Amino acid sequence: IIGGTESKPHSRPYMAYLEIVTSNGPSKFCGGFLIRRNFVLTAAHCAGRSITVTLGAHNITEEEDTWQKLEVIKQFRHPKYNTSTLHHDIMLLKLKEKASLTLAVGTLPFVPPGRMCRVAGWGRTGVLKPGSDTLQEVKLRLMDPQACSHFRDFDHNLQLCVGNPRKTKSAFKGDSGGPLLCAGVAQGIVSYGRSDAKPPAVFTRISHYRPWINQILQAN
Ligand SMILES: Cc1c(S(=O)(=O)Nc2ccc(-c3ccncc3)cc2S(C)(=O)=O)sc2ccc(F)cc12
Numbered sequence: 001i002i003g004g005t006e007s008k009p010h011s012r013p014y015m016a017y018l019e020i021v022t023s024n025g026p027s028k029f030c031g032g033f034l035i036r037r038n039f040v041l042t043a044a045h046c047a048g049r050s051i052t053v054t055l056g057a058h059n060i061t062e063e064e065d066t067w068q069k070l071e072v073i074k075q076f077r078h079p080k081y082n083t084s085t086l087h088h089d090i091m092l093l094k095l096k097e098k099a100s101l102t103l104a105v106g107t108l109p110f111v112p113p114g115r116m117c118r119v120a121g122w123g124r125t126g127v128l129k130p131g132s133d134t135l136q137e138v139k140l141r142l143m144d145p146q147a148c149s150h151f152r153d154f155d156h157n158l159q160l161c162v163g164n165p166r167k168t169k170s171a172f173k174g175d176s177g178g179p180l181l182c183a184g185v186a187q188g189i190v191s192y193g194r195s196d197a198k199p200p201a202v203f204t205r206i207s208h209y210r211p212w213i214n215q216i217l218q219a220n
């Protein structure tokens with residue numbers, strides 16, 4: 001998150017911190033959010049050999065009594081996901097057991113969005129900056145789809161265009177898979193943008209994918 005503020009600890013209790021063992025070699029990190037006791041919603045590009053989810057966290061180098069750290073037992077990547085265009089950049093993760101609902105660990109609820117939205121994550125705080133140890137959040141403006149016309153594979157039906165280009169406020173690297181909320185409702189999933197961090201960025205439009213989500217939930 002660039003231009004954001006350190007979240008009030010545990011104020012976004014749906015937030016998940018994903019530790020992904022990449023199918024080939026090293027470890028990477030994404031965001032995500034808990035939508036049922038044993039399901040996390042994230043980006044398809046965050047898939048890997050295996051994934052761990054940490055719930056209840058604020059500072060991800062500091063274990064707390066709030067934490068619940070859970071292995072992923074099944075990855076449901078969108079079947080039409082495209083590694084090149086990032087169409088359908090959405091993935092459900094089934095957890096090995098159900099999270100305990102606590103003040104610090106809760107599910108996020110699910111009708112057309114307004115302009116001022118908010119995203120949170122532990123990603124980089126600037127182009128060439130480290131990840132944040134602490135959860136950061138920022139308010140971003142939902143833009144018309146034209147504002148993203150420069151992304152050749154953008155598609156208004158599948159995707160939100162997020163972040164006023166005049167400001168530096170943006171989701172960035174490491175913020176993948178985290179939710180965009182508009183009026184307390186989850187509308188987007190951080191997907192991609194410019195590697196120089198100039199907004200807007202591209203998020204997955206969650207409403208488009210609601211039948212697929214319902215299908216996976218109802219059946220697992
Ligand atoms: C994740 C990410 C990157 S990245 O540079 O880490 N990865 C990235 C960047 C661009 C694209 C892409 C470009 C053109 N068309 C489709 C996808 C893809 C990928 S990724 C996440 O697939 O490596 S830059 C950026 C900017 C804003 C943001 F919210 C998220 C991101």
Ligand SMILES: [Zn+2]
Pocket residue numbers: 009010058064066
């Ligand atoms: Zn705490």
